[PDB]
Write a structure and sequence with these properties.
InterPro entries (chain B): Ribosomal_uL3, Ribosomal_uL3_bac/org-type, Ribosomal_uL3_CS, Transl_B-barrel_sf
CATH architecture of chain A: Beta Barrel
Organism (chain B): Escherichia coli (strain K12)
Oligomer: part of a larger assembly
Number of strands of chain A: 5
Helix content of chain A: under 10%
GO molecular function, one term (chain B): rRNA binding
Number of helices of chain A: 1
Keywords (chain B): Methylation, Ribonucleoprotein, Ribosomal protein, RNA-binding, rRNA-binding
Family (chain B): Belongs to the universal ribosomal protein uL3 family.
Chains: A mainly beta, B mainly beta, C mainly beta, D alpha+beta, E little secondary structure, F little secondary structure
Largest interface: A-C, 19 and 18 residues
Number of helices of chain F: 0
Shape of chain F: elongated
Strand order of the largest sheet of chain A: 1-2-3-4-5
Distance between the termini of chain A: 20 Å
Number of domains of chain A: 1
RNA sequence: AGGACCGAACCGACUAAUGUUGAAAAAUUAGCGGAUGACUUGUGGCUGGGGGUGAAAGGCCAAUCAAACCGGGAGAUAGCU
RNA sequence: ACACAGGUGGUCAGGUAGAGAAUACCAAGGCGCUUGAGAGAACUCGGGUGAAGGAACUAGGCAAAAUGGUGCCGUAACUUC
RNA sequence: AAUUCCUUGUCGGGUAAGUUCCGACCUGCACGAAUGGCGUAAUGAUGGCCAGGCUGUCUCCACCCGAGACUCAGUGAAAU
RNA sequence: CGAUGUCGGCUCAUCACAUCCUGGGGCUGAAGUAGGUCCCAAGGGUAUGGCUGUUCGCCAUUUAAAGUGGUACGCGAGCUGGGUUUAGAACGUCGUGAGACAGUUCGGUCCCUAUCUGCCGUGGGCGCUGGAGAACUGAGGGGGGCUGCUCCUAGUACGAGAGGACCGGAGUGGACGCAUCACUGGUGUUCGGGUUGUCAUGCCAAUGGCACUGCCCGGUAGCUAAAUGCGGAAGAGAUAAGUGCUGAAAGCAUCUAAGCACGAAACUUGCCCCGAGAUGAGUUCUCCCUGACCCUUUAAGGGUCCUGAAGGAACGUUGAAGACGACGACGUUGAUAGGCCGGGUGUGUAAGCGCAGCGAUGCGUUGAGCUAACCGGUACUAAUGAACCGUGAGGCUUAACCU
């Protein structure tokens, strides 16, 4: 349940420490973003040597949500802190070479298979 | 074909072996004994009249008791009628059991929903509440405006306003029938059917198939 | 009624081990990746048990690599395989959400030794 | 919307409602019959019958529980010395509601509540 | 929130047509004392269903 | 006095 | 020491909600400002209508104020209703 | 104008905690506020809590939420020192 | 600019985006030196803006607790 | 002008079509993808923020698309009150001045208990031609009608290559709506526990009152959304723009004049709901009443006595039904409500007693004690015999049959 003006932690190491969601992409009037959802973000805090600089507008995918994900047996997986992986604007591939923290098995599709290959837990 | 009349007894969930937990509603579909067969001769249309359960011996009035004991059935709670689509015959007195849904794949369930009573427009019609701070005066969940001005000069019929919500007949359509248990007269459907636990449900095969 | 409890007793498993809040527990669950099925272990701390018969669940909290993960488990679902109660906790509450508040050395609990 | 709910509000908050039921249960136990309104008497049934249930098993913890419910030692004395042995064969239903006209002052439906001994 | 012109006595009586009191159908006769009382109410004499409960 | 049509 | 600080009584009246044929012809509730002073209050005096008084708003002068209230010119006058 | 939620000066002032005449609970003392009984709809009033988010609301962080005591450590620009 | 019409002047900062804010330039419609000019520490129930915390303000409302509204008995207005 | 409250925002809308998107076509300087332009089409949909009082606009990021208008520039007896438009004050300018400014700037009381129409719900009376209990047909009315992305065909058709489909299918989303709590949660001042201050129960222990539920921590049932199932359609008929077939008038040609077939989310149905007050008041099934006599203007008459039937209403216990009515269940030939019993659930190892220690406290008894609305049972208590209303075969005329 990431909406507009939600501050997200950043799972990869593109350089952003903390970003802000500015639109949940896909569909008109859409409210929220889950783990399998692309959003547009802007960067509020960056690392001084990183790739992305503070004040850029690009895209991310959510990887951890405090609202969680509900598996088909009814089980929920509620992380602590909302987290995203920064993607490119039109390439839609991750800008990081590594990924911190665990991610979710319901992210497993081709491009995010390239994401979860770097992931230490799925 | 026809439908069957059952009683809602709670919701449960079926754990299938692959992992997926199907949340089911249990419908105890008892034996429906046919009471009257309406045909083209007397009625100008063809339909059957069924009953289920059993009332007490003295609660049944004399007209109902004569109607039941006219043809071979014992008195149950309420009479119902299904409209017999062109080529099916059910003899008077025949108990119809639940394997009719052991044939079929999808089901629509008709019931009287739970009554919320006199509900306001925010609950009844999903109206957006007015701004709950910023100066608002006795007007948070009020409906707002209900008409334009002098040119209509009247509220149009079918205006969404506060009123009785619930306690009406609604039909939920195309539910997956999960299990037909003839040994305990259980019918289990996937999803939420209308009504409180105990209200009568009319269970038909799905027509939007 | 007698029907719903009957279907619940039909669905439930006969074997499920006895644990309480505070118990450090490994749960092993089935996962699928196409045709290939796999077992995966989740070791954490039981911080909530919701007893309802068939609908019983339990919440296991595990501090993963940097982060805090939390998973509820349907206790009678077939997606779980084993619940090995590794360590026994000595709390005196039934729900332990202050561990969701706490981190680190403040988030540890003494052993039961009943 | 009160579906499948119990407990009457009686136009009193929970402190007033609990204190009034404590006082009314003390009056019914002490006098063996009192006269009140009708819905107050029905909720008084729901209050005062678990005390006579508690009065059957005599123990120090039961005396202290019945003290926590009544806050009068005369009431727990009369309970555990009279209504414990008197109702020990009876299982449930120690009180009887009899409707007695209407109140003169405001036209309120009156009723007697008594124990089943008299 | 005020009337535009006065309502007639005709429209007054029509509204008060539903204000009419309903009398009780009948009272009961107790088995022993034989005095009249409401249904399911104790008598003014204190009898109820053949049983004196209150002096 | 905001109700007056000045 | 202080027209010093925090804060009760006390004096005030910044904001919001309620009240709007009010509980009240200016209040209540929760917060708010001053609170040893150019403070506040009791009691008694003095200033009176083109006059008083005014840390000045045309403010206040008995619920009345760009000239009070009462009685009198006076049945003013009204090309207006 | 009311048996009116307003106004009105001085004197006395106990306990426990508290810096305190604050505030909480009590004493002496005095009251339950001159319509009540049910029910437990919309909506309005006074509140309590709220997943995920956290000013995206709005003229405006208005209102609510939060901060809040004592002791010690520590404390920047600027300054009329 | 409490002054500036044209006008949201133009440039820079803050913002993903800033007719308001901050710093500048002067083209001052129509500043300007006791009807004072320009700075100014402290103050302010003062006007404008930004940040942290915090939140039902809001996304989007949900439930609960009391007082009215509702029903019953007594009394019993009002504008129009 | 003995008053028609005005800009913007909010809430709620509704219509027109001069159509933004979706739908169907003609022409193209239409190879494809994508466009352009024009015709038909109103069923549904038609952003969120920054700035500004703003509408508008500019910008950012989307979307299938972010339509143009009417409705007192819809909407203040529905809310706000930023602008504007009272009284204070100030700036610039004009004036000797009082003052003034479609020039700014700061601040500044938004009243009303709904009689009638209208609308949303909900009943009482009477009618429907003897009365009653049910089940329906269905005139009519209402609701719903949105759409993306990915895959397959197929990287084929087309195209130098870049690129890249029509038609048809399958899945998975967004927004919307209905339903329900099985799950995930919220609430849970009626359940359990911790804990601060104080008062009381004589005191210790243990409890209780008050302090916003004192502050808190979990939480049953209900209710609910963020949770979970479902749905928009496929199909049919008649069409619009358009496309044709045969075909004369006009020996040819020609979609039209005679005739025939296609053709859209629009129209009528199909789906869901209300629905015989549909006064045109319908249909079917069942039950119930099978008495004597008087009077007078012997009339669809009035009266007396006896019987009150089916059934209804009242009364009570009440309900996941409810403002009140209504609706549903039950009334002892009985599980309707309370209690009681067992379980479930919640909280976390009660009180007393024993032991350890100087004591706070710990351990054993002990996953104890207490458990609201849940579940299955149980007549222990209250649902009293009854009385009340409702009658006694139900008009005339004509037709077709049967004694």
């Amino acid at each position: 349940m990431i909406q507009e003006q939600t501050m997200l932690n950043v799972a990869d190491n593109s350089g952003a420490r903390r970003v802000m969601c500015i639109k949940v992409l896909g569909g008109s009037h859409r409210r929220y973003a889950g783990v399998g959802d692309i959003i547009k973000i802007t960067i509020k805090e960056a690392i001084p040597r990183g790739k992305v600089k503070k004040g850029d507008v690009l895209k991310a995918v959510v990887v951890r949500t405090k609202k969680g994900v509900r598996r088909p047996d009814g089980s929920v997986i509620r992380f602590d802190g909302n987290a995203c992986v920064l993607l490119n604007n039109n390439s839609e591939q991750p800008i990081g070479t590594r990924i911190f923290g665990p991610v979710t098995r319901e992210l497993r599709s081709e491009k995010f298979m390239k994401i979860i290959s770097l992931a230490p837990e799925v | 074909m026809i439908g069957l009349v059952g009683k809602k007894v709670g919701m449960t969930r079926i754990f299938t072996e692959d992992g997926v937990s199907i949340p089911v509603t249990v419908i105890e579909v008892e034996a429906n004994r046919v009471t009257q067969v309406k045909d083209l001769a007397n009625d100008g249309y063809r339909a059957i009249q069924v009953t289920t359960g059993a009332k007490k011996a003295n609660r049944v009035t004399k007209p109902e008791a004569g109607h039941f004991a006219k043809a071979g059935v014992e008195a149950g709670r309420g009479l119902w009628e299904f409209r017999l689509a062109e080529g099916e015959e059910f003899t008077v007195g025949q108990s119809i059991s639940v394997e009719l849904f052991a044939d079929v794949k999808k089901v629509d369930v008709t019931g009287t929903s739970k009554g919320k009573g006199f509900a306001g427009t925010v609950k009844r019609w999903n109206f957006r509440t007015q701004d709950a701070t910023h100066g608002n005066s006795l007007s948070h969940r009020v409906p707002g405006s209900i008409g334009q001005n002098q040119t209509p000069g009247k509220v149009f019929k079918g205006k969404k306003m506060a009123g009785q919500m619930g306690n009406e007949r609604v039909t939920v359509q195309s539910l997956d029938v999960v299990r037909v248990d003839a040994e305990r007269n259980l019918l289990l459907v996937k999803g939420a059917v209308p009504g409180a636990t105990g209200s009568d449900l009319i269970v038909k095969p799905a027509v939007k198939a | 009624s007698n029907i719903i409890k009957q279907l619940e007793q039909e669905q439930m498993k006969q074997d499920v081990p006895s644990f309480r809040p505070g118990d450090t527990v490994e749960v092993k669950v089935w996962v699928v990746e196409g045709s290939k099925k796999r077992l995966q272990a989740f070791e954490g701390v039981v911080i909530a048990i919701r007893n309802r018969g068939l609908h019983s669940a339990f919440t296991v909290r595990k501090i993963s690599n940097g982060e805090g993960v939390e998973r509820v488990f349907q206790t009678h679902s077939p997606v779980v395989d084993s619940i090995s109660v590794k360590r026994r906790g000595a709390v005196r509450k039934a729900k332990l959400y202050y561990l969701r508040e706490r981190t680190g050395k403040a988030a540890r609990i003494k052993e039961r030794l009943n | 919307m009160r579906h499948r709910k119990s407990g009457r509000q009686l136009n009193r908050n929970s402190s007033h409602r609990q204190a009034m039921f404590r006082n009314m249960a003390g009056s019914l136990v002490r006098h063996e019959i009192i006269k009140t309104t009708l819905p107050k008497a029905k909720e008084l049934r729901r209050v005062v019958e678990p005390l006579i249930t508690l009065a059957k098993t005599d123990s120090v913890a039961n005396r202290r529980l019945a003290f926590a419910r009544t806050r009068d030692n005369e009431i727990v004395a009369k309970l555990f010395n009279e209504l414990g042995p008197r109702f020990a064969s009876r299982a449930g239903g120690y009180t009887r509601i009899l409707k007695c006209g209407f109140r003169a002052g405001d036209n309120a439906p009156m009723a007697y509540i008594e124990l089943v001994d008299r | 929130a005020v009337q535009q012109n006065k309502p007639t006595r005709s429209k007054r009586g029509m509204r008060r047509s539903h204000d009419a009191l309903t009398a009780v159908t009948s009272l009961s006769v107790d088995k022993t004392s034989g005095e009249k009382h409401l249904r399911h109410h104790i008598t003014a004499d204190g009898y109820y269903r053949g049983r004196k409960v209150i002096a | 006095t905001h109700s007056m049509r000045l």
